[PDB]
Design a protein around this ligand. Sequence first.
Ligand SMILES: CNC(=O)COc1ccc([C@H]2CCC(=O)NC2=O)cc1
Ligand SMILES: CNC(=O)COc1ccc([C@H]2CCC(=O)NC2=O)cc1
Ligand SMILES: [Zn+2]
Ligand SMILES: [Zn+2]
Lengths: 315, 319
Amino acid sequence: INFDTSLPTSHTYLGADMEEFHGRTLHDDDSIQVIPVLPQVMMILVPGQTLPLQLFHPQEVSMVRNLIQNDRTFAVLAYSNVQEREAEFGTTAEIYAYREEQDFGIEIVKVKAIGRQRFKVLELRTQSDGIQQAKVQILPEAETLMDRIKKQLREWDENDDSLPSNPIDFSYWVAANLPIDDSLRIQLLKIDSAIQRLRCELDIMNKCTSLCCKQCQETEITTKNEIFSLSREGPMAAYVNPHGYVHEILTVYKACNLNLIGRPSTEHSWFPGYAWTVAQCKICASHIGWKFTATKKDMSPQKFWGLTRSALIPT
Amino acid sequence: NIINFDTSLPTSHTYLGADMEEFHGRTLHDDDSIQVIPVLPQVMMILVPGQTLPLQLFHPQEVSMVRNLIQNDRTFAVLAYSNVQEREAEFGTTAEIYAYREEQDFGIEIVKVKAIGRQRFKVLELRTQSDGIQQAKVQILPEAETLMDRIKKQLREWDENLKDDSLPSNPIDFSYWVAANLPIDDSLRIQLLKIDSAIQRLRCELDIMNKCTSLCCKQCQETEITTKNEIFSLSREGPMAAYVNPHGYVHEILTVYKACNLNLIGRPSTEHSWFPGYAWTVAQCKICASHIGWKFTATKKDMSPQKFWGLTRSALIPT
Ligand SMILES: CNC(=O)COc1ccc([C@H]2CCC(=O)NC2=O)cc1
Ligand SMILES: CNC(=O)COc1ccc([C@H]2CCC(=O)NC2=O)cc1
Ligand SMILES: [Zn+2]
Ligand SMILES: [Zn+2]
């Protein structure tokens, strides 16, 4: 495995002149705050998880510009029902990198943020100018469980320095990287105790199955056991396509029942040194993810896949 | 200068998919009536009766709303924002869905729609529900052939093809064709939409045409890019039309035969092309490198014109 696993976390495709912020805002337990939510964000976010964004609607640009002038923190709601904008919990996201640019006269803002604190939603109110403000309450934050989880993680993929040592940070690493659906992510986000969070995760890893194509609900694509981490963030990560759409990707060493489309391409690659090719379901041709292929034959691995969470469903 | 290409192809939006469902039904609201019509949250374009609006919708709340629209009157409200940055709008126009197709990419439900502007309105109430959707309480508004010939005369002096069949015979439709196709900024579009009477609209448009100057790149303002005399129409919609990029972003572009102070980026491409038979290359300002639009180049030697430019309204300001 010869590849710098610190390059993906940099999101260099998004831009390399990104202004950086080192100030850190952290709210007290049980404190009630009013935090804006970005209307296009759909992701469930946990503390320690990074969220890259590319925004071009003038209202999102203005609100990020104002956040950058202040505490740089927005609210990422854990929607139980994104079609209905229903959410009871969420995680704050603190912008740590920022970039302005223009394209065709349209002001664009590129942002890189990281989850900081869980919160319970108290009120979701929309302003007269359309922007949404959420009144939230900041929630407060067993090495046997940790060792047991780390044990079954090594059984799935041979991956210590990669995993956090603190039980709180480790519980959130596991919550954000397990190949689980949204309902289980929200279940884990509701849990207040790291001990309880780790114990629920152990139960989830054991009931885990395999990943089928959602459009088929039949054809198996990959499994926990080919999960393969190419990034310090872990085997699961959010990346932005060239037009602002955020994909959550699970990297696996081998996949089944998948065809390729088009020509391997290096543009806007989420894994520097690698080229991507659209992978679709060999049964329904539903796009599922991308196969990445080395650009220099001196790199290991030579082939790996990055499959979107949204295209997969567990058995 | 002579055209050897089917100007009815661009209006079909075949790049959006050629197997679009269509609807024969037509809904029209009574004059001076209050209607409650939903507003798509990411639409930003100023719409006029008779104008086409293509869309590609990703958000599950958008596709739910449009799915429900397809099962009802297929009509949403397009606001003419004074300030998009703050959702400030006093007038608008209804858009009726006339074509539709559902897709699914990476497990994400996708809706593509082609809609046409029908009736303009004044907004009485904008109110966002609990789920986030915006509903607009609106009042449908009620709807000198010398001005018409005077308008048409200076249109021909800009482009020869803008002559007869390319232009509507009715003064109401004609004032809306002109409002949608003049190379004017958003403040003038809103001014024309506010006008209640067609004769008043036509006379305002004649005044605007006489004061029309040139189009400069927005970022640096100094460099001219094109001018009204270089306009020429390659679609039955007219010289000005909205098209969707492959990711759902709607671009309003003006087609012109010649542009200055523009460099090109890379090699021509035929993917997702808005003008079948032509390839596109990103065009950018010579001075400040800002992307301005696209140069279109024919893929066959027997096509005419062999080259033209589609320049976005958003990158251009008047002189
Ligand atoms: C016509 N265009 C489209 O439909 C969308 O185009 C895309 C979408 C996703 C990417 C990913 C691929 C993986 C990677 O490494 N980086 C990316 O941005 C690239 C282009
Ligand atoms: C990083 N950029 C991408 O991945 C692709 O972005 C685009 C944007 C606009 C187009 C237009 C060009 C003109 C035309 O005729 N059709 C289009 O769709 C095409 C691709
Ligand atoms: Zn399938
Ligand atoms: Zn310029």
